[PDB]
Amino acid sequence: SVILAGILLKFGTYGFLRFSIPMFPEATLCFTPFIYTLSAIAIIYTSLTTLRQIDLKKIIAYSSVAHMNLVTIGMFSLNIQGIGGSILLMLSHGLVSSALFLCVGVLYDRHKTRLVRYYGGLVSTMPNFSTIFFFFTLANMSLPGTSSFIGEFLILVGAFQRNSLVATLAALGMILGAAYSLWLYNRVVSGNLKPDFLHKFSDLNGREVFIFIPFLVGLVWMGVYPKVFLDCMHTSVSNLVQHGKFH
Amino acid sequence: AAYFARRAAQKERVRILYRRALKDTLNWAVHRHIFYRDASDLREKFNVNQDVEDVDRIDKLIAHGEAEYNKWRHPDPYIVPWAPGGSKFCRNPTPPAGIEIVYNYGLED
Amino acid sequence: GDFRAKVWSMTGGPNCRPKHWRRNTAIAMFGVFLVCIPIAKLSAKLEQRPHMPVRPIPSQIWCKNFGTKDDYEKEH
């Protein structure tokens, strides 16, 4: 799951940036409203579907569809904020989604269930997992300070200058993304234990703690100081946007 | 018998309806002294039919009574804080028994 | 409670009463004051006061950035 969502999902959006957008600049413009419609429908529809999922992994996996279609919106805005934001969200998603899949994998390795209703009250038995689960839950809501907010807002800036309507529909991801992310966290970690389902617990071991550390450092680093990344991207991004026109 | 069980069930409903109506009364009156009179008028309403013997009349008197309580029930009743629905409910509850914490999980060997 | 005594947390858990909490608390106070040192020097070096105050102020001692932004046509 970590490889599937963190790397393999990026091949399509990378193919838009490497081949489709630069090579066919006239075709890109004619299809921008079409791309905007599909992306905006997907963000709204798949976020509402995520709300009603009952499987831990189904919720996290359904979340990626909403995030990648925000990435398409930014990259088809064809400005610096849009494309730069689309790349930054790509990398940030490859960190947040992988870590969230890692959090659920920790729970499934011990208890061998993915149903949300079986869990609950894990804060009193797994506080270290609960603290790490909460941080990556916040990073999935594009909270300022996390890496995913940098990509999310820069895309909304790029989309606003091209079409205000698509920026408004895309910004509804903030309301819906926060709804299911917090609902997931509270139903799993908060509340009371259910000893009829689960009565034996173990917090994260030394290996699991080390696994999460580079993820925590990665999101905070890009979240507060994204200049190291934007510095190395801007020339290639600028030439991608300018491709096909000469004024 | 069947008539005794059937009438015992009717008694239990009426006793509970009196218990809830008398608690709803204090919710509306708040003050003790107002509550005293409003308590007597409500008891004076159960006393009016206290001697009815027809079993099918009892069922209709109960059903009319239950819908009355349900219609004029105080919209914000008082609840003791640690009782269910109270402001102190489920606050710092005692941990359940039968919980085990495993050490040394996920070792490479 | 009972199992929470076998649960490790950074915040201490329910009813945390460490035996040496005073010496721990003072060690924390010395640390935070130490961290407050580099913050103050960076702040005093980074503060910018375009206007001279009507009266002398505590910051006219540790800060030397007063009335320096008058030629704002030269800002770049």
Partner: peptide, 18 residues
């Protein structure tokens, strides 16, 4: 001593190292 163990590993025997 604190409650629980950091990262849920039992300490080694006294005088020894993990």
């Amino acid at each position: 001593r604190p409650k629980g163990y950091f990262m849920n590993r039992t300490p080694p025997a006294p005088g020894q190292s993990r």
